[PDB]
């Protein structure tokens, strides 16, 4: 069948896999290439010193464990597979209460290229601290940061 081959490929990839261990653990540093697409810069709340931002947050990284040879190059795989493999635990340093939208389903997409270059993007609403200097109010200006990084893993 045309789908049982993909099922066997997925089973082979997941067999022996341990999502608790990052790629190249103990032998190489994991380079995560990231980018952000801001779908809407939300309102700024002066009272809370807070601003909201809605983003497609994309990450990508190599994972030698998830290389394969198959009929098609990149598997536009279901978002369910994101929980079955290691993913970066990126968190926002100045975020206050961020939302990972999951209507109708968890708004994430995962794609595995044949070499092993995983792409993994998610839809988020992050509200983050934007400290303000109101000396020149209402004629003031601000530079609201948006800062993110790994929570558990060091350089």
């Amino acid at each position, epitope marked *: 069948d045309n789908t049982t081959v993909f099922t066997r490929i997925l089973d082979r990839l997941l067999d022996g896999y341990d999502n608790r261990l990052r790629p190249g653990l103990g032998e190489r540093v994991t380079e995560v290439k990231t980018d952000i697409f801001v779908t809407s810069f939300g309102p700024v709340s002066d009272h809370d010193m807070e601003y909201t931002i809605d983003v497609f947050f994309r990450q990508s990284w190599k994972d030698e464990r998830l290389k394969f040879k198959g009929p098609m190059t990149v598997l536009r795989l279901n978002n369910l597979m994101a929980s079955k493999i290691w993913t970066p635990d990126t968190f926002f*340093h100045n975020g206050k209460k961020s939302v990972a939208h999951n209507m109708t389903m968890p708004n994430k997409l995962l794609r595995i290229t044949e070499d092993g270059t995983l792409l993994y993007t998610m839809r988020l609403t992050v509200r983050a601290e934007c*400290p303000m*200097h109101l000396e020149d109010f209402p004629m003031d*200006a*601000h*530079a609201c*940061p948006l800062k993110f990084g790994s929570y558990a893993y060091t350089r």
Partner: nanobody
Amino acid sequence: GSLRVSCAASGRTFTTYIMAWFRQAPGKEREFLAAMDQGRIQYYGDSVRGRFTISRDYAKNSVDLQLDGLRPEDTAVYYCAAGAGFWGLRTASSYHYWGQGTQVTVSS
């Protein structure tokens, strides 16, 4: 050789501001060296990345720069600045407060 240069503020608390260091050699424009943010977050210039180290003491309201592995063309006058980074965090124009500058020279 190694050196440490301190920069203490007075008359205004800069705990919420970004504190940065700049370099001015004879006949060159101001070059950004390093910066520290309210969140203990460090930024460094490429020319001096991995050599210089920036730290902030919020209690006594100062920023310190530790210089290691000096090489002779690093001779210059070093300025300390504090401010909010608007259009900047790397441009001198984004800072409103500046020090008088301290000369530094390296002899071979």
